[PDB]
Amino acid sequence: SLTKQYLSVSNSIDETVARYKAQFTQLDTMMSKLNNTSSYLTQQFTAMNKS
Amino acid sequence: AQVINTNSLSLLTQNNLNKSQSALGTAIERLSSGLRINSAKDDAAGQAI
Amino acid sequence: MASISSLGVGSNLPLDQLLTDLTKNEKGRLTPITKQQSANSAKLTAYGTLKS
Amino acid sequence: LTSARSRIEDSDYATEVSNMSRAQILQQAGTSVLAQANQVPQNVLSLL
């Protein structure tokens, strides 16, 4: 009953932790994309201004 | 014997730039996610299977 | 899959790892749960001892 | 079934690394050439 409730709450908590971490992972992938794009945009500006 | 009214040469470079950039974007998305089927856009049959 | 984050320079991988440490702070959430578990386990052990 | 699902969904590390690496070179070039090509016809023609 009590250690049982612990089993249940541990399980539920674990589900929640996986959820949070997964959200963070996807968000960071989006970050990767945008960072790369903006970085090459920046180099292009620097060169074409050096022009 | 050329034209200031348009830098067709730069226009020519630009499209190649965008094409390469799109290829890179897809590649980096796949390599970061670790899954190639990130959306139905990639493989209709694969996603449903 | 092998994941392989980053590729955008930023140290995203270790940031995610330390969010996993805060995911291990949710393993912390368990830490209350685990202290309670250990208390119960010791209680049951004592009950058995008294039975003997 | 898990193995099959992995084999379908997952990406090939070597292939994707190769593709990304190859594309970045195109990016670097294209940027440089665009800058230079923008610049030179401009100044020479203006000189005339």
**HEC secondary structure over A1-51:** CHHHHHHHHHHHHHHHHHHHHHHHHHHHHHHHHHHHHHHHHHHHHHHHHHC
CA distances from B10 to A14, A42, D31, D36 (A): 55, 18, 10, 9
CA angle C30, A28, D4 (to 5 degrees): 80
Asked if C4's CB is within 8 angstroms of D10's CB, the reply is no
Asked if D45's CB is within 8 angstroms of B17's CB, the reply is no
CB-based contacts of A5-12 (< 8 A; 24+ apart in sequence): A6/C33, A6/C36, A6/C37, A6/C40, A9/C33, A10/C30, A10/C33
* Contact residues, chain C to chain B, C-beta under 8 Å: 1-8
A38 touches chain C (CB under 8 A): no
**What DSSP character marks residue B37?**
-
- Rounded to whole angstroms, the Cα distance separating B24 from B18 reads 10
Assigned token pair, A16 = 């929640």
Coarse DSSP helix, strand, coil percentages of chain D, rounded to the nearest 5 percent: 90, 0, 10
C28 Cα to chain B: minimum distance (Å): 28
A39 touches chain B (CB under 8 A): no
**A5 class by beta-carbon count within 10 Å (0-12 exposed, 13-18 middle, 19+ buried):** exposed
Entry field: residues in chain C: 52
Resolution (A): 3.7
- Rounded to whole angstroms, the Cα distance separating B32 from C19 reads 18
Asked if B25's CB is within 8 angstroms of A32's CB, the reply is no
A35 touches chain B (CB under 8 A): no
Q: Are D30 and A44 in contact (CB under 8 A)?
A: no
Radius of gyration of chain B (CA): 18
Cα dihedral sign, C18-C21-C25-C26:
positive
Which residues in chain B have Cβ-Cβ distances shorter than 8 Å to C2?
34
Asked if B20's CB is within 8 angstroms of D27's CB, the reply is yes
- Determination technique for this entry: cryo-EM
**What DSSP character marks residue B42?**
T
- Rounded to whole angstroms, the Cα distance separating A30 from A28 reads 5
B25 Cα to chain A: minimum distance (Å): 7
